[PDB]
């Protein structure tokens, strides 16, 4: 089991860390959503699908920078939605193929009443998402850590 | 279709204030946002600010923070730009535009996709003056051929806003209109039309 | 603030050729957008998100680039392309435009059609006197005009007014006038 | 408040296909997931699948793959369920429900589907009367058999609603693709045959 | 897929009682266990999600507890409004699975059925049909068995049974049994009895 | 080290059920597959099934699906196998095994004996065996102690309280009418019968009875 | 269920020799393991993935083969290798073991010392009787036993017990028990025990008569 991004950077077997740079909508209105869709960025696969089943969860999701200060919302994961930042581990997603499959995670953040001006700065860190992978075979318990960065500034009208 | 209409050219005194409207039609006003752009010296472009018609919120370029104010009238589907203490550096053409920002777009299309015709603002203390219109006719040495050309000369008006129509709009082609020039503080321009010998 | 620079300020090309425009940024931006403004109208979106043709735009316009260098390429240049082009970014706040790049169209040379008009009787009634000479439908743009009233070289009091490049046959025009007292 | 509105009841024929809708109102449509659930006659619940309104990715129960399809129209905030190649097993109640925190927090009202080849028919009403002597000494029971109608429902009352007590109407049971029903009323032995009790039956589908 | 099992299909109780409904999972779920209530009119509401969390709008009488594979729902002070069917549901793995259901009942003093029988009417006889209807009204508890006899011999075909829900007035049950025969079959026999015990 | 400890021998009755266990130690019990293997006396090895204790997953053999159930207990690190409707086919030794997930390692339990019988504990009967009328026309002779009708195994037999440690052949017992039958032989060069009246010592812990006899 | 077959069921070598045990499969398998079992012990794994040894396995044991043919090889037996060997596959459900291959020791031939015994009078007191026959210290293990009464064959009620190879003499032994009732034993005169084995050119016969013992 190993995951990689759309620009090619990969995390090998056993877990690790990587960086992701996402393009955000330059403006968000009050009462609207800022959508951060990572199902088009992170993909993984099962190396031995004939004999092993891999289970994947979102162990933790934390907010940083402007997302922490100016936003609130939920996270979409495998048929349901949960508060973001997370308060517990999610259900499990099954990986059973050698072909890459999306990691179905998306953020839905709304501006708080104090948000105004440049809410998120370009090149800054907005979230850290931990991917926990177990299996059907042994005691392997690995963490794939993803750091999410903003590729542009986001403004909120006041 | 989608149309944005602004007021005609405005002439103001230094230190005064102006308010420029912009009325939208042909689409739902509150489903899109509004931008204002300044075009100075004929070529330079700079973004003034961004407005949300639902709440009246604004994002300002800090360059124009103390000079412009953005306001909306949701019922009439009209947006307003107001300039506070006009000076000579404020002589420019001002545009309103519909922008697709404010919400998520699946195709990632974020642009000013419809522009209203600009509003030219002149900041001067001079007096407005009617134009002196004269007709132009060939001399008695023409040696007339199959085609002849006639024109009109306009001199000594203010401010620079003059339009010329030939034959009450019946001749929309072969018409040359020339830019105005400053002559002793008053603008002068000309136009010409080409017609066959008939 | 991110400064966008377009160089050179004016470039020229011939019908059916291929030309490229460049925009360079003072810092790295994620996307670039292109607007076109023809003579006597407002700007119009042409290329968005560095590669996407806007609605109702021929496929001969295309964009590419990354980082701090972007470019807009026109293939099979047509007479309708005589306009001004501006690069625009909203990746950083505040949003800025480029300086502008005018496109000129090279074409076969053409002689000017000249007309001369005596001062109107109505103007002479008011006490003024001005003779207007029209030079129409020529190319290239640069051209000199010398006035001749009576036998002397009256090299004073002349106003020249060039027009914008025509959008149908790529020719220019000029209005030359000589103002004196009766 | 949050509401999910489903379409009305359906009556298809075997081998056909049926489309049902669920209109969401009172919240941001694309921020949540929509799930579909089947409850058969017998009250066991079955999960069908979910769809993301934001990008239309679907997940199906292996039991229902091929037969069922989920679609969304984010312009009108409506979800759709399509079921193809209908058989008699497909008759059930279908639900749409929003999903939050792993649970189905708000449910629609349900849509009833009936798969049958029968046709509209007026019921046959047959009175029921006691056998030898009397049933008891102070209490007697009378009945009214309603046999062979389609479709549901039929309505039974006694003496135009005068006898609102001591009455039982049993649920209908399918017999050779036609429904059967029976109703019972009890009255004091001195009231009948001293008075008259008439079974009143109405079948709106047959205009009876 | 993960199997879910509820301890009892039906459970009797009384107003003011404390009620416990238990659910068990074939495989450990990570507290992603839900409780649903369905009224007799067919409407479904969410009561408890994530094993302990009251859904907004639910009565405070309801509570949840459990972990691993064993979960329970507790009603503190039963009310007539709470007489419904309850389902457990897990969301740890796809496909989501539901429990079998537990339907609440009101406790009552047991009663004996009232048996009444009816021969086919003359109208059905002239129409060619013949059906005998047996009524067993107002008994308790729900479980009952009926066997039809013809001329001393048993019959186990052509019999339709219908049961009503629990009465909201006196908390009793009723059931009807119908045996349908052709005209010749009805007329070529002499003894018909309905036995319920 | 890794170790698997199984329960003691079970003596059971036909048509009943039994539950044997295998306690694990020295490794993460919940994260590895546990196999169960049956070995009938005098035959090869059969595979019953496996369980993954963390999630409770099981994979059964088609032959043992209806009879066997498998469970586990995370707290006590103990796996359970349960047999139902114990016919005579079910009398064998059952093993637990963990090898998958460890590189080049394999561990078994010591095995548990399950006996399906309807009989009851019975003291053994010992009968001396004698040759015919003289020695076998040589310097060598053979004798024996015959034990029949006992239950259950095992019994230990010695000759002259272990004095005769050479030329002794004890043969494995054989079931006869739900009772075992074991015999032993002894070879002596002193020409017994008519000499030394050789004695054999027999024990049966099952009934706590000790019997001695003479040839 | 894949069928794994081993042949022959018995192999016999001597100390220092090379012996190869071959296992046959009924399909294609990618993983074949080998286990060793001595009596009264749990099996001990030898080789996995058809070629690789387990922990604490001497280098004498080597594996080979692929697809359907497999073979376990012992370079020089050391009297610690005398056990039963099974092949196994896990590549499909259910897992299936081989039949087993017992190892032995090749020694010289020997003849069985047939010895017949009359039933004890104490046993006859209880009404039971069982004549016995001992054929200890014979080689090889292939042998047949029959009983005769008064010169007449009686193939009923005969139980036979074998013995594993002796750890000292490398020989075998047999026991034959014929159960009879007390009254059916007294109605005859003589009883005969028969023995024939692999290298027995002529049968060995021993008999007794009543009142002789
Ligand atoms: C029958 O017995 C066989 C023993 O011979 C069993 O074989 C073992 O199967 C497992 C699963 O199929 C194999 O996978 C594990 O090993 C790989 C590779 O590492 C090892 O193998 C290489 C080749 O042998 C060596 O060169 C290496 O040095 C190392 O020894 C791991 O990468 C796997 O883990 C990764 O993938 C899984 C699934 O995607 C993730 O869950 C993990 O977290 C990790 O990402 C496996 O751990 C194993 O190699 C193989 N051999 C051995 C000796 O164990 C076979 O499984 C068995 N069959 C059945 C049905 O039980």
A91 to chain E: which residues are within 8 Å by CB? 30, 32, 91-93
Domain count, chain D: 2
H-helix or E-strand containing B3?
strand B3-6
Which residues touch D20 (CB under 8 Å, ≥6 apart)?
Answer: D6, D7, D10, D80, D81, D94, D111, D113
Q: Which of E178, B180, A135 is nearest to C160 (CA)?
A: B180
- Both E93 and E151 in one domain: the answer is no
- Both C90 and C151 in one domain: the answer is no
C78 contacts B47 by C-beta, under 8 angstroms: no
Q: Which of F50, F97, F56 is nearest to F73 (CA)?
A: F56
Give the nearest partner residue to G100 out of F44, F47, F59, using CB atoms: F44
Evaluate: CB of A135 within 6 angstroms of ligand 1.
yes
Instruction: Among G80, G105, G130, give the residue marking a domain's end.
Output: G105
- Both G90 and G145 in one domain: the answer is no
Q: Which of A41, B35, A152 is nearest to C32 (CA)?
A: A152
DSSP state, residue D202: E
- Both D168 and D94 in one domain: the answer is no
**Residues E64, E81: Cα–Cα separation, whole Å:** 19
What is the second-level CATH architecture of the domain A1-157?
Sandwich (2.60)
Give long-range contacts, CB 8 A cutoff, 24+ apart: G141-145: G141/G165, G141/G172, G142/G197, G142/G198, G143/G112, G143/G172, G143/G174, G143/G195, G143/G196, G143/G197, G143/G198, G143/G200, G144/G195, G144/G196, G144/G197, G145/G174, G145/G176, G145/G193, G145/G194, G145/G195
- Both C101 and C118 in one domain: the answer is no
Looking from the CA of residue A46, the nearest atom of ligand 1 is 39
Q: Does the distance separating the beta carbons of E26 and F57 come in below 8 Å?
A: no
Measure the CA dihedral E62/E68/E69/E74, to 10°. Answer: -10
- Both C35 and C101 in one domain: the answer is yes
Closest-CA distance, A153 to chain C, in angstroms, reads 5
- Both F102 and F173 in one domain: the answer is no
Three-state DSSP at A8 gives: coil
Lookup: tokens for F166: 């050479």
Q: Does the distance separating the beta carbons of B109 and C48 come in below 8 Å?
A: yes
Assess if residue G213 is contained within a domain.
Answer: no
Assess if residue G55 is contained within a domain.
Answer: yes
Q: Chain B interface residues facing chain C, Cβ-Cβ under 8 Å?
A: 37, 43-47, 61-63, 95, 97, 108-113, 115-118, 132, 134-139, 149, 151, 153, 155, 176-179, 181, 183, 188-190, 192, 194
CA atoms A14, A19, A23, A26: torsion sign: positive
- Both C63 and C136 in one domain: the answer is no
Instruction: Among D115, D149, D179, give the residue marking a domain's end.
Output: D115
Owning domain of residue G90:
5-105
Evaluate: CB of G49 within 6 angstroms of ligand 1.
yes
| Class of residue F132 by CB neighbours under 10 A (exposed 0-12, middle 13-18, buried 19+) | middle
Owning domain of residue F20:
3-116
Residue A108 neighbours by CB distance under 10 Å: 23
Strands (DSSP E) found in chain A: 2-4, 10-11, 16-22, 34-37, 43-45, 54-63, 71-77, 80-84, 93-95, 101-102, 105-111, 117-120, 125-135, 142-150, 154-156
Q: D193: phi > 0 → left, psi -120 to 50 → alpha, else beta; which? A: alpha
G193 contacts G133 by C-beta, under 8 angstroms: yes
Closest-CA distance, D84 to chain A, in angstroms, reads 24
| Class of residue C117 by CB neighbours under 10 A (exposed 0-12, middle 13-18, buried 19+) | buried
**Residues B78, B80: Cα–Cα separation, whole Å:** 7
Chains E, A in contact: 3+ Cβ pairs under 8 A?
yes
Instruction: Among G105, G129, G164, give the residue marking a domain's end.
Output: G105
Evaluate: CB of A52 within 6 angstroms of ligand 1.
yes
C112 contacts C135 by C-beta, under 8 angstroms: yes
Strand D92-100 vs strand D33-40: parallel, antiparallel, or unpaired? Answer: antiparallel
Chains F, D in contact: 3+ Cβ pairs under 8 A?
no
Evaluate: CB of A49 within 6 angstroms of ligand 1.
no
- Both G126 and G203 in one domain: the answer is yes
Lookup: tokens for F140: 């060598």
Hey, of E27, E67, E70, E93, which one would you mutate to test binding to chain F, going by the most F CBs within 10 A of its CB? E27
Domain count, chain C: 2
G22 contacts G8 by C-beta, under 8 angstroms: no
- Both D100 and D185 in one domain: the answer is no
Closest-CA distance, D104 to chain E, in angstroms, reads 7
What is the G43 CA–ligand 1 centroid distance (Å)? 23
- Both C102 and C118 in one domain: the answer is no
CA separation (Å) from E39 to D3, D48, E84, E85? 18, 22, 5, 7
Asked if the peptide bond before residue F87 counts as cis, ω within 30 degrees of 0, the response is no
E27 to chain F: which residues are within 8 Å by CB? 55-57
Evaluate: CB of A13 within 6 angstroms of ligand 1.
yes
- A151 in contact with B, Cβ within 8 Å: no
- A40 in contact with B, Cβ within 8 Å: no
Lookup: tokens for G13: 């070598």
Going from N- to C-terminal start, the domains of chain A cover 1-157
**Neighbouring-strand partners of residue E120:** none
Residue E185 neighbours by CB distance under 10 Å: 12
Lookup: tokens for F165: 């440690």
Question: Which of A53, A95, A137, A142, when mutated, tests ligand 1's pocket best, judged by the most ligand atoms within 8 Å of its CB?
Answer: A137
Give the nearest partner residue to D141 out of E36, E116, E160, using CB atoms: E116
**Neighbouring-strand partners of residue B188:** B181
G10 to chain F: which residues are within 8 Å by CB? none
Evaluate: CB of G54 within 6 angstroms of ligand 1.
no
Q: Determine the distance from the C-alpha atom of residue A52 to the mean position of all C-alpha atoms in its chain, rounded to a whole number.
A: 25
Burial B98-132 (b: 16+ CB within 10 A, else e): bbbbbbbeeeeebbbbbbbbbbbbbbbeeeeeeeb
**Neighbouring-strand partners of residue D15:** none
Instruction: Among E74, E89, E106, give the residue marking a domain's end.
Output: E106
**Residues C29, C93: Cα–Cα separation, whole Å:** 11
Task: Say which residue the tokens 């104010």 belong to.
Answer: B69
- Both G10 and G77 in one domain: the answer is yes
Q: Which of A31, A25, A157, A22 is nearest to B107 (CA)?
A: A25
H-helix or E-strand containing G121?
helix G121-125
Question: Which of A1, A44, A48, when mutated, tests ligand 1's pocket best, judged by the most ligand atoms within 8 Å of its CB?
Answer: A48
User: What's the fold here for domain B132-196?
Assistant: Immunoglobulin-like (2.60.40)
**Sheet holding D78-84: strands in order across?**
D3-6, D17-25, D78-84, D68-73
CATH 2.60.40.10 placement within chain B: 3-123, 132-196
Hey, of E24, E28, E68, E92, which one would you mutate to test binding to chain F, going by the most F CBs within 10 A of its CB? E28
Q: Which of E87, E92, E29, E35 is nearest to E61 (CA)?
A: E35
Restricting to F residues 50-89, those with a Cβ less than 8 Å away from any Cβ of E are 54-57
Q: How far apart are the first and last CA of chain E?
A: 41
What is the G46 CA–ligand 1 centroid distance (Å)? 19
Give the nearest partner residue to C45 out of B63, B113, B188, using CB atoms: B113
What is the second-level CATH architecture of the domain B3-123?
Sandwich (2.60)
| Class of residue A130 by CB neighbours under 10 A (exposed 0-12, middle 13-18, buried 19+) | middle
- C161 in contact with B, Cβ within 8 Å: yes
- Both F91 and F131 in one domain: the answer is no
- Both G140 and G97 in one domain: the answer is no
**Residues F98, F150: Cα–Cα separation, whole Å:** 38
D124 to chain E: which residues are within 8 Å by CB? 124, 127
**Residues D27, A33: Cα–Cα separation, whole Å:** 12
- F131 in contact with G, Cβ within 8 Å: yes
C120 to chain B: which residues are within 8 Å by CB? 134-137, 153
The CATH number of the domain where E99 resides is what? 2.60.40.10
**Residues G174, G137: Cα–Cα separation, whole Å:** 9
What is the E92 CA–ligand 1 centroid distance (Å)? 27
- Both E148 and E100 in one domain: the answer is no
Looking from the CA of residue A47, the nearest atom of ligand 1 is 39
D75 contacts D19 by C-beta, under 8 angstroms: no
Q: Which of D115, D47, D53 is nearest to D78 (CA)?
A: D53
Three-state DSSP at E70 gives: strand
| Class of residue F104 by CB neighbours under 10 A (exposed 0-12, middle 13-18, buried 19+) | middle
Q: Which of A44, A62, A41 is nearest to A142 (CA)?
A: A44
Q: Which of A158, G190, G35 is nearest to B57 (CA)?
A: A158
B52 to chain A: which residues are within 8 Å by CB? 29-30, 157
CA separation (Å) from E33 to D95, D104, E100, G168? 20, 11, 14, 68
Closest-CA distance, A19 to chain B, in angstroms, reads 22
What is the G52 CA–ligand 1 centroid distance (Å)? 14
- Both F28 and F102 in one domain: the answer is yes
């Amino acid at each position: 089991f190993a995951c990689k991004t759309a620009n090619g950077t990969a995390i090998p077997i056993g877990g690790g860390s990587a960086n992701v740079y996402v393009n955000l909508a330059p403006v968000v209105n009050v009462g609207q959503n800022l959508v951060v869709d990572l199902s088009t960025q992170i993909f993984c696969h099962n190396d031995y699908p004939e004999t092993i089943t891999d289970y994947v969860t979102l162990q933790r999701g934390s907010a940083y920078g402007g997302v922490l200060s100016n936003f609130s919302g939920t996270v979409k994961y495998s048929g349901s939605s949960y508060p973001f930042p997370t308060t517990s581990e999610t259900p499990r997603v099954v990986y059973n193929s050698r072909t890459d499959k999306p990691w179905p995670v998306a953020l839905y953040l709304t501006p708080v009443s104090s948000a105004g001006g440049v809410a998120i700065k370009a090149g800054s860190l907005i979230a850290v998402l931990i991917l926990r992978q177990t299996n059907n075979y042994n005691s392997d318990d690995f963490q794939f850590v993803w750091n999410i960065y903003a590729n542009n500034d986001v403004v909120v009208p006041t | 279709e989608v149309l944005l209409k602004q007021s005609g050219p405005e002439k103001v005194k230094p230190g005064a204030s102006v308010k420029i409207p912009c009325k939208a039609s042909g689409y739902t006003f509150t489903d899109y946002n509004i931008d204002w752009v300044k075009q100075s010296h004929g070529t330079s472009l700079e973004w003034i600010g961004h407005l949300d018609p639902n709440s009246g919120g604004t994002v300002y370029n800090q360059k124009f923070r103390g000079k412009a104010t953005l306001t909306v009238d949701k019922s009439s589907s009209t947006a307003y730009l107001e300039l506070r203490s006009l000076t000579s550096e404020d002589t420019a053409v001002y545009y309103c535009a519909r922008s697709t920002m404010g919400v998520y777009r699946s195709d990632g299309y974020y642009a000013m996709d419809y522009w209203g015709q600009g509003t030219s603002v002149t900041v001067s203390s001079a007096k407005t003056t009617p134009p002196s219109v004269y007709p132009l006719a060939p001399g008695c040495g023409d040696t007339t051929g199959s085609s002849v050309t006639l024109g009109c000369l306009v001199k000594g008006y203010f401010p620079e806003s003059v339009t010329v129509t030939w034959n009450s709009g019946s001749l929309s082609s072969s018409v040359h209109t020339f830019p105005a020039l400053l002559q002793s503080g008053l603008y002068t321009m000309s136009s010409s039309v080409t017609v066959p010998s008939s | 603030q991110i400064v966008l620079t377009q160089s050179p300020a004016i470039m020229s090309a011939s019908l059916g050729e291929e030309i490229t425009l460049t925009c360079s940024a003072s810092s790295s931006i994620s996307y670039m957008h292109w607007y076109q403004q023809k003579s006597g109208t407002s700007p119009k979106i042409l290329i968005y998100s560095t590669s996407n043709q806007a609605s109702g735009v021929p496929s001969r316009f295309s964009g590419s680039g990354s980082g701090t260098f972007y470019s807009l390429t026109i293939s099979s240049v047509e007479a309708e392309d005589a306009a001004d082009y501006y690069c625009h970014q909203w990746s950083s706040y505040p949003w800025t435009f480029g300086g502008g790049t005018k496109l000129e169209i090279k074409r076969a040379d053409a002689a000017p059609t000249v007309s001369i008009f005596p001062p109107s009787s109505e103007q002479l009634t008011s006490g003024g006197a001005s003779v207007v000479c029209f030079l129409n439908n020529f190319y290239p743009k640069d051209i000199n005009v010398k006035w001749k009233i009576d036998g002397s070289e009256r090299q004073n009091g002349v106003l020249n007014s060039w027009t914008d490049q025509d959008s149908k046959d790529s020719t220019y025009s000029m209005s030359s006038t000589l103002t004196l007292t009766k | 408040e949050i509401q999910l509105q489903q379409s009305g009841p359906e009556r298809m024929k075997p081998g056909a296909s049926v489309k049902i809708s669920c209109k969401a109102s009172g919240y941001s449509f694309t921020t949540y997931y929509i799930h579909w659930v089947k409850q058969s006659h017998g009250r066991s619940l079955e999960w069908i699948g979910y769809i993301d309104p934001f990008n239309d990715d679907t997940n199906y129960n292996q039991k229902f793959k091929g037969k069922a399809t989920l679609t969304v129209d984010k312009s009108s905030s409506t979800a759709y369920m399509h079921l193809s190649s209908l058989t008699s097993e497909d008759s059930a109640v279908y639900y749409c429900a929003r999903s939050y925190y792993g649970s189905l927090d708000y449910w629609g009202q349900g849509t009833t589907l009936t798969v049958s080849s029968a046709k509209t028919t007026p019921p046959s009403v047959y009175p029921l009367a006691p056998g030898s002597a009397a049933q008891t000494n102070s209490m007697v029971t009378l009945g009214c058999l309603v046999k062979g109608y389609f479709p549901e429902p039929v309505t039974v009352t006694w003496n135009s609603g005068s006898l609102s007590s001591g009455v039982h109407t049993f649920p209908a049971v399918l017999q050779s693709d036609l429904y059967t029903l029976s109703s019972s009323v009890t009255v004091p032995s001195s009231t009948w045959p001293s008075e008259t009790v008439t079974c009143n039956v109405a079948h709106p589908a047959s205009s009876t």
